Every structure is written in C-alpha cells, then in structure tokens.
Amino acid sequence: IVEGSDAEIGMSPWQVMLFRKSPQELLCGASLISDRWVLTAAHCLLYPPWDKNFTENDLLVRIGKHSRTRYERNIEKISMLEKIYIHPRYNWRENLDRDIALMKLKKPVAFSDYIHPVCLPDRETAASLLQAGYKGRVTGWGNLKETGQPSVLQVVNLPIVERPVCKDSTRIRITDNMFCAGYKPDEGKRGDACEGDSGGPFVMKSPFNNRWYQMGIVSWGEGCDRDGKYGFYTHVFRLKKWIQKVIDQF
C-alpha cells in the first residue's frame, strides 16, 4: 500500500495473508468470508505470463495478522487449503476480467478479537454504495512504493472513480466486472495498492446497518500511485452468483 498508514489492532479482522511455503514469502492478500472460506484474486494463484500456477499444497493462509514478517504467537492462526476454485471465465490473457478465486480451508478457523469475517454485498448494498466519490478502504502488506516493505498491515481510504475516467486512464479494455478507485491528480491526496496487495479487500462500511462489506478485490494497476492512473478492483457483487454457486456446491 502506497501513501497509507499502519492499521489499528483489529481494524481489518477479515484480512488474510496468502503465504508461500517454500520459499517462505508473501504471495498475496485475501479475505475471510466465513469460518471455512477465503476470497482472493485469481491472478494470485494463476497467471501464466509470470509462470504462476500454485496448487493447494504450495500455500498457507495466515489469519489474524498485523505484523508482516513476525510469527504472531497466540494471535494469528495458520490454515491449510483443501481446495482452490478459480472463476471459469477468468481472463488472464487480456485484462484480468473476473479476477476472483475462492479457497476452502481444511478446518474451520476459530473467530477471535483479531479474526472475523467480512460481509459480501447484496444487490441493494452494491447499488447504494458503488458510486463515484464514495470511499472504500484497501488493506495489505504489499510494497510501500512502486520502485520499501511495511512492518505492519497498511490501510488507505480511496474514492471510487467515475467509469469514463477509469476507462480514459488506460489502454486496457475495462469491463463491468471491474471498478477503479483513487484520487485524481488535482485532488492532492494520494494512495494506491501495490505489489503484494493483490487479492486483498476493498471494503465499505454501510451507513444503513453499520457493517463492513467487501465490494472489491485488489486486481491491477499501472505502476503504483502514479498520477493519472487508478487501481482496478474486481466487482464482487457482479460475481456473487458464482461465489454462491461454489459455496453451495462444495
């Protein structure tokens, strides 16, 4: 996260770290959506242009974390993966359309002050909140700058951007399964996701019921925190039927 700040303790108790076993390193962010299911970006698991194709046994899920590198004894919980499900129409070839994946844990994780699931939006909450100017919050342990690394989880609040501005910022074909967020050059404030934040959540706090909803998944950008560029996020509600199909089936 570029131009963010240290998270408060327990601020994002749904935040998950995807951790590579060998070599031991941060792979991506992710989020906890129930005691057995974790949501992330498909490109965290499958991205052939970078020779990325992880299997269940390559990875661990670390939940309840704050420190990036420390083993947070008695706080974090480490889970193994039972199964990965990648969206069948995930478009890694072109533009990362439908950049979404689910991971089922081998065993349920116990909730605590530091571990708690985020809500997924329904149509109404999405309609109300996914509007240009409305701000969400992005969290992760990725790089502090495009070209270093944080001691603890970082957080930044960013406004959703009008779709024409998103489109006009890039040569990539944007789809309805994406939205973009970030400040414009003239707005002064800044901030963005960056390498390592992939797969983490873009959340909004509903003013109707005071619950946090995951509206987006950190997907792609052009550099990090560049003037005139924006971060692009998977539109979770637009892909919720798939999410529900997977959870209902498996």
Partner: peptide, 29 residues
C-alpha cells in the same frame, strides 16, 4: 454469517477507528 462485518474491537464495543468517519462523510446520499 449473521455476525459478518462487525469487528470485535470496534463495532462490537461501539468504538470507532481513526478514519472510518472519512468513509461515512463520502456517502453523500
């Protein structure tokens, strides 16, 4: 879950985090 999105150290105790108000203020409808 019925309890989703409510943080033990914040909403469950009626404590606010340092920047959530920034989000609320942007929700102008």
């Amino acid at each position: 879950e019925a309890d989703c999105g409510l943080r033990p150290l914040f909403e469950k105790k009626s404590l606010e985090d340092k920047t959530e108000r920034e989000l609320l203020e942007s929700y102008i409808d």
